[PDB]
Design an enzyme around this catalytic site. Sequence first.
Site, PDB file in Angstrom:
ATOM      1  N   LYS B 220       0.797  -1.221   0.000  1.00 15.32           N
ATOM      2  CA  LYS B 220       0.000   0.000   0.000  1.00 15.32           C
ATOM      3  C   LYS B 220       0.834   1.277   0.000  1.00 15.32           C
ATOM      4  O   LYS B 220       2.038   1.247   0.257  1.00 15.32           O
ATOM      5  CB  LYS B 220      -1.073  -0.020   1.099  1.00 15.32           C
ATOM      6  CG  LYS B 220      -2.207  -0.994   0.755  1.00 15.32           C
ATOM      7  CD  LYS B 220      -3.397  -0.902   1.692  1.00 15.32           C
ATOM      8  CE  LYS B 220      -4.699  -0.934   0.899  1.00 15.32           C
ATOM      9  NZ  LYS B 220      -4.789   0.240  -0.025  1.00 15.32           N
ATOM     10  N   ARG B 254      -3.872 -10.331   4.268  1.00 12.36           N
ATOM     11  CA  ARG B 254      -4.236 -10.339   2.855  1.00 12.36           C
ATOM     12  C   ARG B 254      -3.061  -9.751   2.081  1.00 12.36           C
ATOM     13  O   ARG B 254      -2.751  -8.571   2.233  1.00 12.36           O
ATOM     14  CB  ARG B 254      -5.487  -9.479   2.656  1.00 12.36           C
ATOM     15  CG  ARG B 254      -6.015  -9.417   1.216  1.00 12.36           C
ATOM     16  CD  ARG B 254      -7.225  -8.484   1.126  1.00 12.36           C
ATOM     17  NE  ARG B 254      -7.703  -8.393  -0.244  1.00 12.36           N
ATOM     18  CZ  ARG B 254      -7.271  -7.499  -1.129  1.00 12.36           C
ATOM     19  NH1 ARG B 254      -6.363  -6.598  -0.772  1.00 12.36           N
ATOM     20  NH2 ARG B 254      -7.747  -7.503  -2.372  1.00 12.36           N
TER      21      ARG B 254
END
Lengths: 274, 274
Positions: B220, B254
């Site tokens: 991210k 995840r």
Amino acid sequence: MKWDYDLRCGEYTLNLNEKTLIMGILNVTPDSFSDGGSYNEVDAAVRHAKEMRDEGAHIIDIGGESTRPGFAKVSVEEEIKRVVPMIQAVSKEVKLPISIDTYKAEVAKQAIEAGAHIINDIWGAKAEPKIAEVAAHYDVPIILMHNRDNMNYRNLMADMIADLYDSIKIAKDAGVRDENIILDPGIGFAKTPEQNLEAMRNLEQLNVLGYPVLLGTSRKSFIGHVLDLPVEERLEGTGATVCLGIEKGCEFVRVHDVKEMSRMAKMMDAMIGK
Amino acid sequence: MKWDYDLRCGEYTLNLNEKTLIMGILNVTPDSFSDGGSYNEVDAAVRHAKEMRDEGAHIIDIGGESTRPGFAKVSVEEEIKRVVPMIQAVSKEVKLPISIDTYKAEVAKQAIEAGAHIINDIWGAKAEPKIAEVAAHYDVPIILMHNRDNMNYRNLMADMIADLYDSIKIAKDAGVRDENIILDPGIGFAKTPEQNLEAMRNLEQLNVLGYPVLLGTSRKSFIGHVLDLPVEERLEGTGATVCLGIEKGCEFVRVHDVKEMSRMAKMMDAMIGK
Ligand SMILES: Nc1noc2ccc(C(F)(F)F)cc12
């Protein structure tokens, strides 16, 4: 914050608060036809130190043959021929503090004369107590690692803390100032694989002693024991130990893979508010 | 220990206690000349799922175009043409539970008909409340992620917990059983880079809600913000977030890089006594 002093290393100064300090491992690659100081030998060392510097290392840890991981039976005479040329060249060509990885007083002394700034002792001044006097004499930081000639603990962590304190006492009795003391839990030494994991899990306990803690788990066997992976496939495992170590408050990590571990340390630092 | 139930996923059962569960991210690579179901498109998906399976993934997360990271404006009609063939083939060829990454009720429903086992909702049943009814209907686990259309918090963590509870209420009011609820802090969503780091730092607070927590930090932007590294150079950063997440008690992670993150998760598990 946590530390109201900086770690003084001669010309260099290490802040203990702003980031986890990365100590890059440099082991000697001895030439088979000489006792030390050869071009190829030292040039290899110098190149690896520049590389680790460029990759984010804050300290270069230099070890001769007598220390980990080889533990050679070698005299101080022999050992000095080997480590002194490395310290001279690295200190000259690489502008980072240098730690000498030895438990031998005379090697520590000459290493420091040669330009080393920090003593890193895998026996915690217990094998050769005079190493603490060398350290006090030159007023350099000394890393006291937990170690013992056996794995017969009553209670691992309580015993580790007792053993480390025995090291601290030797050091202070020789004149080592508190600010020149760093501790190391000695992961991978005198511990079963299960005890190494238990030491990792309770690492934050070392903090009550009031001294900076260096963690050295890089590529070690217990990681292989968990992942069933050989030494070259232990980046991920090392990383996990480094992140957990930082979360539990360690000030240094001693690692082979400086590039990867510096990135991981830097991210951990940012998250924990370091 | 911590969980006195297993997570029931149709033919598959996930133990929440014995190890951190790895959820592998599979995004659709759409063919430019068709609306879905083509050989190359689905074969790519199937191959990536087998790969992630072989690398240690326990769950395959499948997303169409409308969801992260692309957020395409696409109809449920279009989206179903695309995700259904993938779920059909992956579920058939890869023996792992499949999560459908959608916030749309109708997509969730058909995904489950097609073979998906878990609903993963980036809007926490708030964008389309009927997704909770779909979930209750089919008795599948649903992942409720923290999200909001703004970054105007009064107190980040307190607000996150309030928002998640609002999601829990929607879910339970529709009939979702407690054991079918998983929470996700929504790192990288509706948060400044600094708020993402603060959420990471206080992650253990989500635990008081009494539900399993899935962490999704992979590659991210905030990691890029800290390391100043592009998306392909974020392995180390992701890893750090994964280790810290596991230390703070998360049950799932995840991730894109299953091989590396599984090794790191496995080592963390071993150290924390999982
Ligand atoms: N940048 C990398 N290349 O290959 C890797 C393997 C592991 C890791 C880890 F897990 F340590 F971050 C990083 C890399």
